[PDB]
């Protein structure tokens, strides 16, 4: 009955009641109401007390909402960060159960008047007002893993000049990020990712662009700058393992530099793993010998053997017959000194270069670790610029064959020299000035490589150039231009005078269509100087 009680003494009754509510246990007069907790004091109290009491209770309500975040967010269904954030937020509540202990002892001697209380709790009213704002901005938007570590890096930058609520939010972040940073030292220095609850930025799966994928939500927003070098680090560690300390600081990057000192070793072990063991540069030269048609003493002996059995139509030739000739073509030739020669397979394409002869092309099979560089996506390109060179090699192989048949009616001699001087002036440009210098760049461009995703750039950067400098990228006039050359060989092989001159007006017109389009551009211009040299075709 505080109404029938004196004034100066009832104030000492409230300060002992108000000294419990700061702990959580209810009181005699200052009671709690069922649930943001709202209290009631009393109907009949002095006006100059309640208006002062209601100024302190915002430290009780801001405590009946933090101890409910500790008892709750410590479960196992929330991850290894909503745990540490709830432990480091529990050491503080202990330091608040002491600041109410020192007051319950200092009150025994009567030395604690209500006006004196309103001064002592001033720091405990500001600290409990930060923990009651993180415990409501972590449950507003459901945060677990990284997103509950992005929040503790922005709620720490907004207090960039307070210095009494930044030394706090820098104690929570420095403690709610050790478990997250303890799996990061397992993903950079090794390939293993434990992460029982799905919270890490990188998750694995069950040919390798789908195994490990960056998760966008769980990025701490202070590793956003290096969100790529993290994933690119461990992935290098797994393609070698299966075959054969970091701390948090603000305004200091003692971890940002630490990631690079490992990524720069994560790549140096893999790149060197591909050059010395299961070598790559001594492995690509086993492709240039066949696909780019560099070995001559092998093709002049293969087409000489497998010609009659190639002119037969498609779905008429038995692959057990071709492969028996391919094996015999390699060993008898000078390609016998090639360790990787046993990976050449015959592959008859269904479509032509948009039968029998126009449907022949080599196929190359490679093992796992090298299949990252040379794969089915970047091998059919080797198989696209091969047929374009096997076609041009076949025609002037028989055009040189009719050269002896006629040599023991006499106006086709000056026309044959017009087509021979065209294909034999395309081969020289297609080989010695498009594919010979461009490859020579790659060989040197692989000595200064730094990481695999760069070699994967110096390679596809070489195939898109060969397919661009050549006529492979449209310019279909070359296809129809080649038809009258090979067909003219058939006419001469049938041993009329009104047909030789018919091919002239047809082929010469097709040739002038080429140089008209080859000239109109912004090398693709030096090709004209290879076609005509003595000023011919000046029209």
């Amino acid at each position: 009955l505080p109404g029938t009680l004196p004034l100066a003494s009832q104030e000492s009754a409230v300060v002992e009641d108000l000294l419990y509510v700061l702990v959580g246990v209810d009181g005699r007069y200052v009671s709690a109401q069922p649930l943001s907790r709202t209290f009631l004091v009393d109907p009949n109290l002095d006006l100059s007390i309640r208006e002062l009491v209601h100024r302190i209770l915002p430290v009780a309500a801001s405590y009946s909402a933090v101890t409910r975040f500790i008892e709750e967010k410590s479960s196992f269904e929330y991850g290894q960060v909503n745990h540490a954030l709830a432990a480091a937020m529990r050491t503080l509540v202990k330091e608040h159960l002491i600041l109410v202990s020192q007051l319950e002892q200092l009150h025994r001697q009567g030395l604690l008047s209500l006006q004196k209380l309103w001064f002592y709790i001033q720091p405990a009213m500001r600290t409990m007002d930060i923990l009651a704002s993180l415990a409501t901005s972590v449950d507003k938007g459901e945060c677990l893993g990284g997103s509950t570590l992005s929040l503790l890096h922005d709620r720490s930058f907004s207090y960039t000049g307070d210095s009494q609520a930044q030394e706090l939010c820098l104690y929570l972040t420095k403690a709610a990020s050790a478990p997250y940073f303890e799996v990061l030292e397992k993903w950079i220095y090794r390939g293993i990712i434990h992460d029982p609850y799905s919270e890490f930025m990188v998750e694995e799966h069950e040919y390798w662009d789908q195994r490990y994928t960056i998760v966008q939500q769980q990025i701490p927003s202070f590793l956003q700058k290096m969100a790529d070098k993290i994933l690119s680090t461990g992935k290098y560690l797994n393609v070698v393992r299966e075959c054969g300390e970091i701390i948090y600081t603000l305004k200091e990057r003692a971890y940002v530099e630490q990631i690079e000192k490992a990524f720069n070793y994560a790549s140096k072990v893999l790149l060197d793993f591909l050059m010395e063991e299961k070598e790559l540069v001594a492995h690509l030269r086993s492709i240039k010998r066949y696909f780019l048609m560099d070995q001559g003493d092998f093709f002049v002996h293969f087409m000489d053997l497998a010609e009659e059995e190639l002119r037969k139509p498609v779905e008429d030739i038995t692959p057990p017959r071709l492969e028996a000739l391919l094996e015999l073509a390699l060993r008898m030739s000078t390609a016998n000194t090639d360790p990787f020669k046993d990976d050449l397979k015959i592959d008859l394409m269904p479509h032509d270069l948009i039968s029998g002869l126009e449907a022949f092309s080599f196929d190359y099979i490679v093992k796992w670790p090298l299949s990252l560089i040379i794969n089915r996506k970047a091998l059919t390109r080797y198989q696209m610029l091969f047929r374009h060179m096997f076609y041009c090699k076949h025609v002037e192989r028989q055009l040189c064959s009719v050269w002896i048949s006629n040599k023991t009616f006499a106006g086709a001699f000056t026309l044959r020299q017009r087509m021979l001087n065209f294909v034999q002036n395309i081969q020289y440009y297609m080989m010695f000035e498009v594919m010979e210098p461009t490859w020579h760049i790659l060989e040197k461009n692989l000595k200064s490589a730094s990481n695999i995703d760069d070699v994967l750039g110096h390679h596809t950067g070489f195939l898109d150039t060969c397919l661009k400098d050549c006529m492979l990228t449209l310019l279909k006039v070359f296809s129809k231009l080649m038809s009258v050359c090979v067909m003219f060989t058939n006419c001469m092989q049938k041993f009329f005078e009104a047909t030789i001159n018919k091919f002239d007006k047809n082929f010469s017109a097709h040739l002038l269509d080429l140089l008209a389009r080859l000239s109109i551009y912004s090398g693709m211009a030096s090709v004209i100087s290879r076609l005509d040299f003595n000023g011919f075709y000046t029209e």
């Binding site: 008047s113 006006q115 001064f119 009494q164 211009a525």
Partner: protein, 572 residues
């Protein structure tokens, strides 16, 4: 109503909690000697409300900024102490009286009168503009106030000096709320504009342009250049200036050779080579004579490439030769040909699409004044082989002579204007550029030295805007050189035909009357041609003596009037 009761209530009114009730705290009996002092003492509570409402209303919204927090969180350290005083005063109430309170609370009636009047002077200011309105309370002189406010300034100006030490050494500004006076735009010309409104008062307007230039120097050094790494306060800005800028030039001269392009862009684009442009005018002669419709760019490149291989321009850096190409302006081939020298990348911030729109505006004038000279050395070459053939016809030298004098009078006007182009336009205006580059720095004394280098050449040459009447007057003189070259070979060839017939008319026989009429009429056509060169010359001199009058118009042109009027061949 005792005196101890008022002291009980007053100790609450000092905070806002109300006998005394709530703008003065009207008290409602007692003697007049008490009400008067109570109303005077309570006026410290009304000062405590106004300072509390601000630190409570503005501590609610989250759009008050980062500086507005260090202020609203520095009005609290100056209130905990005011809560310590109320603690002590309450322990003694159990003796103190009104007339005793006045001396106790005489000082905190002043601190609660500066702070309660410091939050009204800065009401709507946020960001740096607030750190500039709590500095305008330091010019007060009162040693008690100037040593209080000069402490709140040391807290409010901490976030401001946090962006500054971030935008200077790292060049990464980040403020969701617009506080810093450097406002970005989602490179040199745009994206970084000073903010006239959020500059703190304690930072002079010139110092605010050394930070916006230091931050931009580092942000541009990272992205485009593709490279990665009070009085002590004034010394810090200059220390960061004389190091960052001096490093920006080193990376812009070793990794891109900005200087080696300026010299190479004078040799070719400004005809400063001479050896290369000479051979280039001999090879384009058979091509440009045709109309423009039959001209296609892909053919000329082979000719240009041939010249660079023949002349001395072959011994040259391969990089600068990769950019030297041709472009076709959109007549005759001598009206649409021009070189371009396209430049892209980090070096493109010095030329900025305007220096490439001025050089071509200049290159046309140097190309015309170069073909108008190689024509006049072709004519002067014809006459040295002309007189070596028809020196046996004494009836033709009378009119052939007027063909020589008109030439030697025309080649002077051109061969003299060439010197004014070399010495008084190129060699003189370029010297003031290479002198303000080997001593300049910070890449902003280079742009301003290269930009004015294109405002004098446009002015020293007649390509200005207000000198239009002068250039169109010069073109007429450029045209009279062509009309001579057309009226010369007509008179030249007509004498070689009559000479060739006279050779065969006597060599096969060694008739006589039927040719004397042909030879006789040929002598009669001579005075007809003489009336051409007599009226062509008399009109050529009428367009030059008019040209000189237009030069007396804006000062360097006077050095041209002396070049032409040497020995006073004109001006009577």
């Amino acid at each position: 109503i005792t005196e101890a009761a008022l002291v009980r209530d007053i100790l609450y009114v000092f905070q806002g909690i109300d006998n005394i009730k709530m703008n003065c705290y009207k008290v409602e009996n007692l003697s007049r000697s008490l009400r008067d002092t109570a109303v005077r003492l309570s006026e410290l509570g009304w000062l405590h409300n106004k300072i509390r409402r601000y630190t409570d209303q503005r501590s609610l919204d989250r759009s008050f900024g980062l500086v507005g927090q260090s202020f609203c969180a520095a009005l609290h350290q100056e209130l905990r102490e005011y809560y310590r005083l109320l603690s002590v005063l309450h322990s003694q109430l159990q003796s103190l009286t009104l007339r005793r309170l006045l001396v106790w609370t005489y000082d905190p009636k002043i601190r609660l009168k500066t702070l309660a009047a410091l939050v009204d002077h800065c009401q709507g200011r946020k960001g740096g503009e607030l750190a500039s309105a709590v500095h305008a309370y330091t010019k007060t002189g009162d040693p008690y106030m100037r040593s209080l406010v000069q402490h709140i300034l040391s807290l409010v100006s901490h976030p401001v000096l946090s962006f500054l030490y971030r935008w200077i050494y790292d060049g990464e500004l980040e403020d969701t709320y617009h506080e810093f006076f450097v406002a970005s735009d989602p490179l040199w010309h745009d994206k970084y504009t000073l903010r006239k409104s959020m500059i703190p008062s304690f930072m002079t307007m010139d110092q605010s342009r050394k930070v916006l230039l230091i931050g931009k120097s580092i942000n541009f050094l990272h992205q485009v250049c593709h490279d990665q790494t009070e009085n002590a306060f004034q010394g810090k800005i200059d220390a960061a200036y004389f190091e960052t800028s001096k490093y920006l030039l080193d990376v812009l001269n070793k990794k891109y050779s900005l200087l080696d392009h300026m010299q190479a862009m004078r040799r070719y684009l400004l005809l400063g080579q001479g050896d290369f442009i000479r051979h280039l005018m001999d090879l384009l002669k058979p091509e440009l004579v045709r109309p423009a419709t039959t001209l296609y760019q892909h053919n000329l490149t082979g000719i240009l490439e041939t010249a660079v291989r023949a002349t001395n321009a072959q011994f040259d850096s391969p990089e600068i030769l990769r950019r030297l190409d041709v472009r076709l302006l959109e007549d005759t081939g001598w009206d649409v040909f021009s070189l371009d020298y396209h430049v892209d990348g980090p070096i493109a911030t010095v030329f900025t699409r305007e220096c490439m729109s001025h050089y071509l505006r200049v290159f046309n004038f140097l190309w015309r004044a170069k073909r108008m000279e190689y024509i006049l050395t072709d004519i002067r070459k014809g006459h040295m082989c002309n007189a070596k053939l028809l020196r046996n016809m004494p009836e033709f030298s009378g009119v052939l002579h007027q063909c020589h004098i008109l030439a030697s009078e025309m080649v002077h006007f051109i061969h003299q204007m060439q010197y004014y182009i070399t010495f008084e336009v190129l060699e003189c205006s370029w010297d003031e550029l290479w002198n303000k580059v080997q001593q300049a720095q910070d890449l902003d004394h280079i742009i301003a030295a290269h930009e004015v280098f294109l405002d004098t050449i446009i002015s020293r040459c007649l390509l200005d805007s207000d000198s239009r009447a002068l250039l169109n007057q010069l073109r007429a003189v450029f045209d009279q050189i062509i009309e001579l070259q057309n009226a010369q070979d007509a008179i030249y060839r007509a004498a070689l035909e009559e000479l060739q017939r006279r050779l065969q008319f006597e060599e096969k026989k060694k008739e006589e009357e039927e040719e004397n009429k042909r030879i006789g009429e040929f002598k009669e056509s001579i005075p007809k041609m003489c009336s051409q060169l007599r009226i062509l010359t008399h009109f050529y001199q009428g367009i030059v003596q008019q040209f000189l009058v237009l030069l007396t118009t804006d000062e360097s042109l006077r050095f041209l009037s002396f070049r032409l009027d040497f020995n006073e061949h004109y001006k009577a």
